[PDB]
Subunit: 250 residues, 4 copies
């Protein structure tokens, strides 16, 4: 039977590309989304056209709250309900915006930034593991620039740092169950919609390898390697896919 | 007049030794505490016996919730209220317990406690500290030398301490233009947990290359003192391991 | 026309597994060796029996000396002589033995071998590789996942593997504009030393969270093949651990 | 009895400041120099003027060669000859210049010998000699906060500073049972190279978050003083950045 993967925030951009590549590799997919219903459904329909009954969607807010553990259990459960199994979890969904130290309240910002980037991945990991020639693994989308952060992104950066912790802690704890846990750490990949080209170019010009951002597919390629049979000894590793950006001094 | 410092979880163990050593150095101190009211009040008495009106206690839960920001604001406000200034913040308070991934508090409570005390409260305290501001302003965060070689089944804790590294770095960057330095001190094995059995304590002691023993609370405090001092005025974003070489030892 | 690769120390163990996998992927290969001539020739024979004129051997000492630069130039030149191009360089050859700080070979010989093979020869091979240059050019350095948790009394070996991390990063930066990617693969416990008895092997195996066993040579080679592939064309300056979680395990 | 310290490359700049502060703290000092004899003697004269027979000079090239081990043994021996003891070793001497990988005075192997010898091999040999000849004993290695974000075309220098991180960590582990602590101080931008253009100096200064200026030599020395002190007696294998946040600033 075909293996199955959950990809969070999979309606657009990197998560979409990850879902597509997994599908092309032979996985059935749960496309998790928050607000982007039309795009999630569009993707599911495209994937099911290619092969019937191989893609479903699952809506959830991954903001931290009292109901987050249940929402996370329900995402994993939907993979088991659709496909009978859950082999791969990709923690991709992420809130990203500034929170300077000096209309959303700060606790709402905490909930969203820390919930999406850290707590939801932890809860999803718990639910994934509890539900367990297998090749089980988790891939967390990290940040190559986590030790050279953008100015005034404290909470975002804290979330991504916590995600490195999770990757390492879960790699250690789940290794006896045969579940590998790794990361992929983009530098500059797809830039924000509507960011002016002139500002995109300030970031692009910093990248040693080609003075361009990573495509979503280039990020997805590293995810594919990590879930593959060619990575069966690899756990707790975080692979930068950054064109050398992180090596560049100020 | 004398500078002033806030130390969180300062009623006992490492936080107490930090508060003591700051006070010996010249600081007026806010002794924050959660449950350890008797020990906090007793420390404030000891320090005030040495120099009157140089210590106050301040009670707060640093578990994450919708009122955590107000609580953190109030800790900083309590230093200004007692002393008219706030020069140093030491983020020492910390929950520490296992949260296994695979099968009596709820998981949401565990998240709130472990992530709140180790990460969110230091963030909010840092915000309130900066907002309220010769001078030598700085923050010291109590980190963990074993953050990349964590205890088995401590994912939430480890996540909190990793986030604390991120905060230390991010706040060092953002607050540098205001002359506020932000650094860390990362113990390996120091005062063993009260609940840990004697055999397990001896197991941990035996892992430490430099002396086969735990760091004293005073040894940790010595590093905090250095970082807040005039001898550390160009140091920001640095995390100093005080671990006797423990983090260097392979499995 | 098929691309071509140089693998240093390729007569056996991990270097052989890398050359075999590259050859299976469609590369022509230069099998560098130092003392292991029989094994090297035996490998070239096997690969050439599979596809004619696709493997050659190349002998060189990679100990540091005043002629090491000429030796490294000649290794690269051997790939151009055989195959008319050189797309991939794998720096695998390595001396590995203790050098106690307190107490056969003179210390300067130990420096020349340990630092030469692990760091200086990779540097010179990298210079020659770059100087001699649809296309997918890259270099892969065999690093060590335990570089920050080293074996006791292996100072010079550890210094050499640390230098190799530096080269990997420096070379990635400097050669990015030429389209040459520079990455590493960092084993933890893979094939154990021939001189190690089974009991000592089992002590190391038991340390590994993922399966309590060493990485196969093929498992190491798999990570090399990825980094040289089209699937890694935005990856440069990255060191991939292939260690089964070993580096995450505390003392 | 006053403790004694060896400081390599102590005639000028950061090494001079380290020698001065150690001396001011109560140490007797060996001022090592290569080319700067006039300056080394001028320093010694100044220090002996404060306290008679507390400063001596010691000449040596620290370029790697057949004779480097003997030269390093004699640097340590000079401290025991002058003062009867050797408590502290500061590995400060360093060659620093570019070594491009791609080319359009020195042979590349001479560059290897200077850059890797001064920054890594001489520190290793001085460490062996220091430990062999053996209280608050420690070693401090001058590292580089930008070791993972290196200057373009400085591969060999960077390899040497990476190897020094390895030595710091390896020696911390191996010498801990002897009570010898081994730590590092990692500047970012401190005293700018004398041959750097003034416009290039201001470009580096403007990058620094904490004050948009370089560290003074004394602010670097302050961190050395902490690490050798009784306030750091549980600290080994630690590298303290003194970089004003520079290493945290993205491209
Ligand atoms: N792009 C880059 O350059 C870059 C750089 C470094 C790291 N990364 C990381 O790589 C991953 C993918 O990057 P990306 O740029 O493609 O991400 P993105 O577009 O910023 O976010 C991906 C998705 O996250 C979901 N999300 C946001 N808030 C959510 C919430 N409260 N609950 C549930 N889902 C939520 C959204 O789903 P809906 O649209 O359905 O609402 C969104 O489409 C992220 O983890 C990101 O942090 C990206
Ligand atoms: N001891 C070690 O070996 C070691 C190792 C690595 C890192 N560290 C770090 O160094 C610091 C000091 O360690 P330690 O062992 O002295 O700490 P500890 O005794 O575990 O905790 C210090 C204090 O934190 C406070 N605290 C706990 N939960 C709290 C909450 N919800 N709200 C407010 N305060 C709370 C407690 O105050 P009350 O008693 O008043 O309730 C406690 O006394 C901690 O950050 C720790 O993680 C220690
Ligand atoms: N095995 C592991 O568990 C492990 C762990 C961490 C890192 N690594 C790294 O991964 C790589 C492969 O490991 P391995 O165990 O397969 O290596 P290895 O067997 O120890 O050495 C591979 C080859 O290095 C060559 N070599 C040694 N000294 C040389 C010299 N002076 N000049 C030229 N070549 C020389 C030898 O060639 P001849 O036989 O032709 O003389 C040898 O066959 C190495 O870089 C190693 O440091 C391995
Ligand atoms: N300045 C900075 O911004 C900075 C930044 C990062 C790291 N660092 C590190 O901090 C330390 C001090 O920096 P600095 O700028 O003061 O150093 P420096 O002036 O570049 O060098 C200090 C001394 O090294 C000695 N030296 C050079 N080559 C030598 C050789 N072949 N044999 C013996 N001695 C030799 C010289 O002694 P003579 O003059 O007697 O010949 C020189 O005066 C160095 O380790 C450096 O790498 C400095
Ligand atoms: N868009 C988007 C991001 C989603 N997660 C990100 N994380 C970082 N560290 N940077 C980001 N960007 C702003 C700097 S340039 C690369 C894009 C993003
Ligand atoms: N008490 C306490 C701790 C507070 N934060 C800690 N962090 C770690 N990684 N270990 C700890 N300990 C368990 C190992 S032995 C020393 C104590 C503690
Ligand atoms: N053989 C071999 C090694 C080549 N480079 C190595 N580097 C380390 N840190 N360990 C190694 N080993 C000793 C620990 S068990 C696996 C082998 C080797
Ligand atoms: N002098 C001197 C240096 C000795 N080691 C150095 N390492 C780095 N990474 N930068 C340096 N400088 C050039 C950049 S500006 C600060 C000085 C030096």
């Amino acid at each position: 039977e075909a293996p199955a993967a959950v990809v969070t925030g999979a309606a657009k951009r990197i998560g979409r590309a990850i879902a597509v590549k997994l599908h092309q590799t032979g996985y059935r997919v749960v496309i998790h989304y928050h607000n982007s219903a039309e795009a999630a459904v569009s993707l599911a329909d495209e994937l099911n056209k290619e092969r019937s009954n191989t893609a479903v969607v699952c809506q959830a807010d991954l903001t931290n709250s009292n109901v987050l553990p249940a929402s996370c259990e329900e995402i994993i459960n939907s993979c088991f309900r659709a496909f009978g199994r859950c082999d791969v979890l990709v923690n991709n969904a992420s809130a990203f915006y500034p929170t300077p130290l000096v209309g959303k309240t700060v606790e709402t910002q905490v909930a969203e930034l820390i919930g999406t980037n850290a707590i939801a991945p932890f809860l999803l990991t718990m639910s994934f593991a509890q539900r367990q020639s297998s090749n089980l693994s988790i891939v967390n989308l990290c940040d190559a620039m986590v030790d050279q952060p953008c100015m005034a992104f404290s909470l975002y950066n804290m979330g991504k740092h916590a995600l490195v912790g999770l990757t390492q802690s879960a790699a250690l704890e789940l290794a006896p169950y045969g579940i590998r846990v790794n990361g992929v750490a983009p530098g500059v990949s797809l830039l924000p919609v509507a960011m002016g080209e002139e500002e995109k170019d300030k970031w692009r010009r910093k990248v040693p390898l080609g003075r361009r951002e990573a495509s979503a597919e280039q990020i997805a390629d590293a995810v594919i390697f990590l879930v593959s049979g060619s990575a069966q000894y690899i756990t707790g590793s975080i692979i930068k896919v950054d064109g050398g950006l992180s090596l560049v001094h100020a």
